[PDB]
Amino acid sequence: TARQRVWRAFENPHTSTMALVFYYVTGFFIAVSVIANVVETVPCGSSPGHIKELPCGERYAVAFFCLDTACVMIFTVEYLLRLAAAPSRYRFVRSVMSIIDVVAILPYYIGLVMTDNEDVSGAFVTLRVFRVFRIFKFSRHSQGLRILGYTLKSCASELGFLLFSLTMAIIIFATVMFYAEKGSSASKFTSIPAAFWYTIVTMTTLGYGDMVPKTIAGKIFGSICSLSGVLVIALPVPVIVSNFSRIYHQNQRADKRRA
Amino acid sequence: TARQRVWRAFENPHTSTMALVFYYVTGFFIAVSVIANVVETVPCGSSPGHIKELPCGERYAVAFFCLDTACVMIFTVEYLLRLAAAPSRYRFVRSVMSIIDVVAILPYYIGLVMTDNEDVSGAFVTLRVFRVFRIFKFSRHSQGLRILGYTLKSCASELGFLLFSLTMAIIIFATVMFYAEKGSSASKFTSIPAAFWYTIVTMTTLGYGDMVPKTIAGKIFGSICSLSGVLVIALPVPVIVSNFSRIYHQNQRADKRRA
Amino acid sequence: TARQRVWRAFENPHTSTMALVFYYVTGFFIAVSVIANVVETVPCGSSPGHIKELPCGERYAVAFFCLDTACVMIFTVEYLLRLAAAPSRYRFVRSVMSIIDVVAILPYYIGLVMTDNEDVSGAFVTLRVFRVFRIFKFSRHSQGLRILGYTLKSCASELGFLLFSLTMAIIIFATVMFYAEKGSSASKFTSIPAAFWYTIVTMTTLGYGDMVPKTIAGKIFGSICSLSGVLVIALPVPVIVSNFSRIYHQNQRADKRRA
Amino acid sequence: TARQRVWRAFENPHTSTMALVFYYVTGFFIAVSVIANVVETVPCGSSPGHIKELPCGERYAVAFFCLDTACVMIFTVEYLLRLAAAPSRYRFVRSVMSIIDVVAILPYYIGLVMTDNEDVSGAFVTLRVFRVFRIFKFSRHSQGLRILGYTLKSCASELGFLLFSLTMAIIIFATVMFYAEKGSSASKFTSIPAAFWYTIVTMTTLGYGDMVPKTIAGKIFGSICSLSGVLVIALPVPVIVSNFSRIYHQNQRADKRRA
Ligand SMILES: [K+]
Ligand SMILES: [K+]
Ligand SMILES: [K+]
Ligand SMILES: [K+]
């Protein structure tokens, strides 16, 4: 019953004080790792006798490696405790938070086994990006984030239809704008995939202005693109918001029902 | 009864296996033609001994023509099968999907009969644009796309009123902004039709920045244009979304009623 | 009873054929005047022996004056018929459409009495702008435009509160952004009224980019400005849309009640 | 009972005529101080024998100081009257409007005690910014502003969750965009905190264009950032609007109940 006691401590943090302090230590370490990963890209001005600026993670690489390894050992000891001390380990491993934890953890050890070639980019930048998935470990700490996950899973069909309609609108308007605007001088509409960028920026009403139409047909079809993008995007948003509010309200009725 | 058997196979794909494979082959060929039409505009780097980059559809014109003709023969044999094997051929021909199919098909044969003069643009770029209407043949494959078509037909009056109000707002604010901004140095507000572009970009909250006001009156009226455009655009969107959700929900009650 | 017969012909166009043709002739002339006023600002290329381009209304000033005077005599004979042949002339004159008609008409005669000094701008551009108020005469022809007017009058309090909240947000964020950004090199934030433009462009999510913050405080407060503007603007829009849909639906119940 | 008479005069202005004129004088002085603070940053052209333009508050520093001190003595005499003539002074002092009044008042006296060093910026610009909190004294004059405050307090949890989700989305997309775009030539994505600006401008659909992606991965993730920002921002806005409309309607039922 020790394993199920550990499981009820991990799943419910407000049952003991040991579980609560474990919970808050894990939250603090997640925040520290996230902040350190963000900070290490900031330049530390100019060093004494330095030609150019050097990021926090390069001027102090040893300290940042020590911080990252401390956070990663904390994360992996927590994960192994969750694994070896769960009732049904298949259910735990296939549970979403377990994949989140392993995606947070493994990049560090993959970087370790690739220590021979570290100056080379490519896989390096990929692991550096995948280190941000440790912010998804706050889902275990935020109820609203779990609500967001639940309502994203609930509206999978609506999200898929939104993606399909967006894809079709992007193809249509990119084709139209490329063919209307390929002939302009110094045109940025060098292909239909190039016009994908203009179409997606226009339909969302961003308007960066790095690609703007310069032809009368371009103006007309960009206007139609703006309006049609507004209408297409606004189709599943009400359903998504309805599901989000419904999930939140259902949880608040449940809270008042049991308390 | 062979013709009505063919018709029930085409209209309902999940009745046989022959109809299902025909359905999925048509879907695959539609996707292939769409992807090829998008891809052929991409440059293939630099060829050996080539002065400039050449698009995929020009460096490999024969292969792309072969792919396009295979897709078009598939489309036209499917269309002729639908035509000659339908119960009421007037109803089929006047049905929206039939016009969609003929608009997808005919540009290819029109390009064939115009093979004498192909280097000339104009009609060429028009046929190239009209080749994207083959993406509307996925309406026969997507239920949500048919929902979108049904709710666009349902809100025809709301869409027309939106177009009328947008036209009036564009005229008013283009006149105001042109007269406020015609006097600026190197002004892009060279006419009221020129200010149509600024007004439509401003009311949709795009903000490209290729045309921005430089006069105090220009700033004031551009601000009013932004706000009024938000309010005008937001008038029929709730009705359109209500109709879309109502159509989708009606179909989901129908699905649970018959299944 | 001749005057009340004329009044019932003008107020209700689908009662006779004379009233209907009068109605449609007035609509056609309103459209023609609007189109001519828009078109006359377009340049007519280069004339034979012309140094620079000349607008349609300057190369063909006599023709455009003839068109404008024909439209204005039509408008004023219609207005005088409405006036002298109405039951209660105080109620007619104070009715909104009467002020719309007089604002459409008078600029022409004011321009006539100012024929001595026409090359001078100022009052000239003001009359040219006020000539666009003839597009509001389509309110007598569009039911949806009357719905829009009714729902704008209905939400006068909500619109006023929106204006007040927008004014306060503009003042606050313009002050904050000016003081954060006055010190930048070549700064466009030369005063708080200058930062009014940045604040109003940011809160509406336009993002022209002609004024962007260059300081860390500027970035932070511009982000807060964007979010707060979204929330502030989104407060009266649901009420306005509710009123618009309610007015439209009330009219559609009335239509089905009496027909 | 004199103190409670003063309190009922201050709390309810439409009870006497003395209270009403006091109320409107305070409102007028708040408006005057706000307008003067905005205006003093405007340049007064070029003075006779002046090298450069000088703001209204520097060319006429004595007059603006006199106006500011008159407004501040009015504000502080009103505040001391409210304080010394309230039933429960702890409740008054801890009441929100009291903190608003003291924040409006104190910057002036802090500037007075710092008269020795005034040319130095830093604290000076901070006090100048804090002088705009006198616009929050219109909350005592506007009912809708109090409604906005009440609905902001009501949706504190929703606002906090919006802030948390925005923070996570900003971190994730800033990391992704920095790592995708750090390698571009003359890149503005010099760090993840630098990409905070791009992410917040993109998620709100501003699109300034001062930072735009130049890499294919940058374009893809900027598109995903735009869409995800729209969905994330649109989650608490319906709840906020529901609360705002509910508060306003509750007050309008209360008004019709007691009147
Ligand atoms: K925008
Ligand atoms: K926008
Ligand atoms: K923009
Ligand atoms: K822009």
Swiss-Prot record, chains A, B, C, D:
The lineage of its organism: Eukaryota, Metazoa, Chordata, Craniata, Vertebrata. This is A-type voltage-gated potassium channel KCND2. Changing I233A: Loss of channel activity. Residues 42-61, 117-122, 181-192, 213-215 are extracellular. Residues 143-156 are annotated as: S4-S5 linker. Belongs to the potassium channel family. D (Shal) (TC 1.A.1.2) subfamily. Kv4.2/KCND2 sub-subfamily. Detected in ovary, in corpus luteum and in granulosa and theca cells in the follicle (at protein level). Highly expressed throughout the brain. Detected in amygdala, caudate nucleus, cerebellum, hippocampus, substantia nigra and thalamus. Expression is not detectable or very low in heart, kidney, liver, lung, pancreas and skeletal muscle. Not detectable in human heart atrium. Changing N243A: Decreases peak current amplitude and causes a positive shift in the voltage-dependence of activation. May increase the affinity for the closed-inactivated state of the channel. It is found in: Cell membrane; Cell projection, Dendrite; Synapse; Perikaryon. Changing S157A: Increases peak current amplitude and causes a positive shift in the voltage-dependence of activation. May increase the affinity for the closed-inactivated state of the channel. Changing K153A: Increases peak current amplitude and causes a positive shift in the voltage-dependence of activation. Residues 193-204, 205-212 dip into the membrane without crossing it. The chain crosses the membrane at residues 20-41, 62-84, 92-116, 123-142, 157-180, 216-238. Changing C155A: Increases peak current amplitude and causes a positive shift in the voltage-dependence of activation. Changing E158A: Slightly increases peak current amplitude and causes a negative shift in the voltage-dependence of activation. May decrease the affinity for the closed-inactivated state of the channel. Changing L163A: May impair protein folding. Phosphorylated by MAPK in response to signaling via the metabotropic glutamate receptor GRM5. It comes from Homo sapiens. Changing P236A: May impair protein folding.
